[PDB]
Structure 1
């Protein structure tokens, strides 16, 4: 069955980073979207999943998420590989890990466990790796002597603002859960104003791809533990740091197919792990478009650095996913624009690809976190814009640059764009008066191909990871479960860009 969206994306990754095929990106067949029996859309792990209700009484999404995480871990025989953005998983996120690990030990296993979080240079960790190690050992009680732990927090570049941001849970290199969800109880669980977010669950060869990606990060992390400014590392009971846990677990038993879903696994190494793919022939025309609102102080890796692309194929994967849309594109993000300075405010090539689609009559929908959510990351900050015009004005600019004339630019912008801030009910905010925070990193195209993972469309130079799936049947579920309901409530917060009918 054909895959015209994946083929275009694959063409662009082999051109961008051929040397990273098999570790930072990889196409595979034979995957399964891992739904529980009698819950066919249950691969889609949305949270809170309480559409239509400003009081959010029944969080069926959250419940399904925590359950799936517990069960995947409960099935572990050898390896459990976790990555996130610091702080370390707490609350129910942490209980899911501890309970799943106790179940695994009770079935007679001795699992190896790696937990990796990235930390911003400015971010003071309350619970450091050794304390988090000891906490887990304590909750594990007697199970503990059977579990080998590597726990690490890491920053790859203080100067270039790079650290881990991927959110992965890989068990035995065969199941994988990823998406936008950090394991932060106050934002997601214990609150009357829960963050809305989505992960997906999968099994199959694409989970081994995720393991390879985590191995790459752990190779760097184990080596750089000689620099405590970069890596804090705690292991259990004399255990070595385990750079290649996933490779060691895969041995060579070519991954078994579990279904019929084709997938591209695609991540990025941010700054400070590898400078380029020396193997790569990539040589793009970079755009040249100053921003009127903001002039960046830092060297701009998003807009103006060839080598950065070659070690961050996810950037091109996303640009060319959007470029492959023939009919419509839906984007659901925290932000399309970044805080400038220190970062560039937007990705020029992404805005151009969008402008190009607008011009060609492709329907584009952008839904972002409500600007009311502006604030510090990790402390309720879920917006980086003051107004939605910051998105529609940039698009106008690029449309004008692209079409030459300001009238055509207006046809395309007013006829083909839906732009709105997110809501999940008829209320404008949560029943407790807090605005809806959106943390999706989702892009869907033509009701066939979609991306879920941890990579934001706004400029950021982090280690990230995600999956692009091509399957009409899956897209249809995504449409029904998430995108249609999102639009039903968010259309009431639709923006009319300046200059439109």
Structure 2
């Protein structure tokens, strides 16, 4: 069974970060999209999952999500490995963690647990690691004696604004849930305007790849606990820091297949963990589009730093995923552009790839979060279409061609999940997908936004016509059904 899209992505990863294979990216065969029997699309964990109701009254997505989390953890035999943006899991997210661990202990096991969160310097931490550890210990009751906690918040670079942003749940390095959903009850659960987001659940060797990525973050995190400005750390039962929990779990036996789904796991180290992959002969011709509505404040890692690329292969991975499209791409994101200063307004290579797809007659759909959330960094959808026009002209020298491609081949809109322009409680819909789909064959689900950001992130790229058909039916077709009523008409179009 052929995988032209993964092939193209793996080529780009081998060119960019050969030395990070086996830790920050890895391609595997034999995975299973982990769907509960009776619900074959249930591996797709969207939230809230209330299409067609501005009252978001029947939240099938959230239900399925929290119960997959609980069950995955309830089945832990050795290791539970959680990462997220701060705060530490709370509300129903925490109940999943505690019920799962208690059930694991009840089954006779002694789980080792790492919970890791990134924290922006701006962010003042309500529940600090030691406070959060004590709360878990209290809720674990008599099970706490059987649970080895590691709990940490981290910031790898204040000046370059790098901290963990990956959203991972890895159990026994065998099951893994990942996507854009942070363990924050207020965004997703206790609200009449839930954030729309998506995770995916799988089992098999790609889960171990996610474990190896987390080992890479905890190796840095454990050592840098000597600097409390960067890492705050709390453990239970007098336990040491556990930097290689997943490698110990894996031992030396290779990972065993659970299905037939090929997957690339791909992450990034952000800034302040590893300067470069010295293995790499990556020598890019980088593009210099002078953005004159904000001459970048900080050093531009997204567009003008070869070294950054070598320790963040996810950037090129997403670029080549898009570039491997031969028929159509759907992009569902919070945003394509970042706030400048201090970050660059956009990723030039990403926009050049999209522009190239338009010029080639490839269909491009971009659905982003409503600008009224500004949970949105553009003042207008036309900032996206104008940038695509600028790059189109830069690459073809043909503004007439640019208008045909842009008016004929571009679908650009703000996100909606019902016929109403906003949630029934008056707040606009907020979109937090980090999703890219190509040719109804391969798709990215993970934490890496397409807009410029220099964080640790992680995600999976699946190539499966059956799975992508499910993604289309359960998410992309519904998204367009309601979002096209908020479509932009770009300047220069009828």
- Which TM bucket (shorter chain)? over 0.9
Alpha-carbon distance in structure 2 between the residues aligned to 1:237 and 1:428: 51
Within 5 Å, which residues of 2 pair with 1:321-336?
321-336=321-336
Cα shift readout 1:455-476 (whole Å, capped 9, x = no counterpart): 0000000000000000000000
Report SS of the residue matched to 2:301. coil
Cα shift readout 1:237-279 (whole Å, capped 9, x = no counterpart): 2100000000000001100000000000000000000000000
Report SS of the residue matched to 2:405. helix
How far apart are residue 15 of structure 1 and its match? 0.6
Report SS of the residue matched to 2:289. coil
Report SS of the residue matched to 1:409. helix
How far apart are residue 405 of structure 1 and its match? 1.8
How far apart are residue 156 of structure 1 and its match? 0.1
Cα shift readout 1:280-302 (whole Å, capped 9, x = no counterpart): 01101000111121111111000
Cα shift readout 1:391-418 (whole Å, capped 9, x = no counterpart): 0111111001111021111111110000
CA contact (8 A) 2:337 2:346 kept: yes
Within 5 Å, which residues of 2 pair with 1:388-407?
388-407=381-400
How far apart are residue 174 of structure 1 and its match? 0.2
Alpha-carbon distance in structure 2 between the residues aligned to 1:17 and 1:325: 22
How far apart are residue 123 of structure 1 and its match? 0.8
Alpha-carbon distance in structure 2 between the residues aligned to 1:161 and 1:95: 31
Alpha-carbon distance in structure 1 between the residues aligned to 2:144 and 2:299: 46
Does residue 168 of structure 2 align to residue 141 of structure 1? Answer: no
Alpha-carbon distance in structure 2 between the residues aligned to 1:183 and 1:149: 17
CA contact (8 A) 2:282 2:310 kept: yes
How far apart are residue 366 of structure 1 and its match? 0.1
Cα shift readout 1:365-423 (whole Å, capped 9, x = no counterpart): 000000000xxxxxxxxx11111011011111100111102111111111000000000
How far apart are residue 480 of structure 1 and its match? 0.1
Alpha-carbon distance in structure 2 between the residues aligned to 1:164 and 1:208: 19
CA contact (8 A) 2:335 2:450 kept: yes
Alpha-carbon distance in structure 1 between the residues aligned to 2:285 and 2:263: 28
Report SS of the residue matched to 1:466. strand
How far apart are residue 454 of structure 1 and its match? 0.2
Alpha-carbon distance in structure 1 between the residues aligned to 2:148 and 2:356: 51
Cα shift readout 1:424-470 (whole Å, capped 9, x = no counterpart): 00000000110000000000000000000000000000000000000
Alpha-carbon distance in structure 2 between the residues aligned to 1:237 and 1:338: 43
Report SS of the residue matched to 2:19. helix
1:359 alignment counterpart: 359
Alpha-carbon distance in structure 1 between the residues aligned to 2:437 and 2:368: 14
Alpha-carbon distance in structure 1 between the residues aligned to 2:8 and 2:187: 37
Cα shift readout 1:175-230 (whole Å, capped 9, x = no counterpart): 00000001111110011100000000000000000000000000000000000000
Give unpaired runs (5+ residues) of structure 1: 374-382
Report SS of the residue matched to 1:182. coil
Cα shift readout 1:136-159 (whole Å, capped 9, x = no counterpart): 000001010000000000000001
How far apart are residue 74 of structure 1 and its match? 0.1
Alpha-carbon distance in structure 1 between the residues aligned to 2:204 and 2:274: 28
Alpha-carbon distance in structure 1 between the residues aligned to 2:34 and 2:437: 19
398-407 or 153-162: bigger deviation: 398-407
Match of 2:471 among 436, 460, 478: 478
Alpha-carbon distance in structure 1 between the residues aligned to 2:101 and 2:467: 30
Alpha-carbon distance in structure 1 between the residues aligned to 2:260 and 2:187: 35
Within 5 Å, which residues of 2 pair with 1:99-114?
99-114=99-114
Alpha-carbon distance in structure 2 between the residues aligned to 1:412 and 1:427: 30
Give unpaired runs (5+ residues) of structure 2: none
Report SS of the residue matched to 2:271. coil
Tell me how large the CA RMSD over aligned residues is. 0.4
Alpha-carbon distance in structure 2 between the residues aligned to 1:53 and 1:151: 38
How far apart are residue 305 of structure 1 and its match? 0.3
2:49 alignment counterpart: 49
Report SS of the residue matched to 1:263. strand
Report SS of the residue matched to 1:38. coil
Alpha-carbon distance in structure 1 between the residues aligned to 2:398 and 2:461: 35
TM-score under structure 2 length normalisation: 0.99
Alpha-carbon distance in structure 2 between the residues aligned to 1:292 and 1:431: 40
Alpha-carbon distance in structure 2 between the residues aligned to 1:154 and 1:77: 27
Match of 2:484 among 478, 491, 494: 491
Alpha-carbon distance in structure 1 between the residues aligned to 2:280 and 2:394: 31
Alpha-carbon distance in structure 2 between the residues aligned to 1:406 and 1:421: 25
Report SS of the residue matched to 1:275. coil
Cα shift readout 1:350-370 (whole Å, capped 9, x = no counterpart): 000000000000000000000
CA contact (8 A) 2:297 2:340 kept: no
Alpha-carbon distance in structure 2 between the residues aligned to 1:390 and 1:404: 20
Alpha-carbon distance in structure 1 between the residues aligned to 2:65 and 2:295: 41
Residue correspondences, number = 492
List 4+ stretches of structure 1 deviating above 3 A. none
Alpha-carbon distance in structure 1 between the residues aligned to 2:93 and 2:272: 29
Cα shift readout 1:279-333 (whole Å, capped 9, x = no counterpart): 0011010001111211111110000000000000000000000000000000000
Alpha-carbon distance in structure 1 between the residues aligned to 2:76 and 2:344: 42
1:438 alignment counterpart: 431
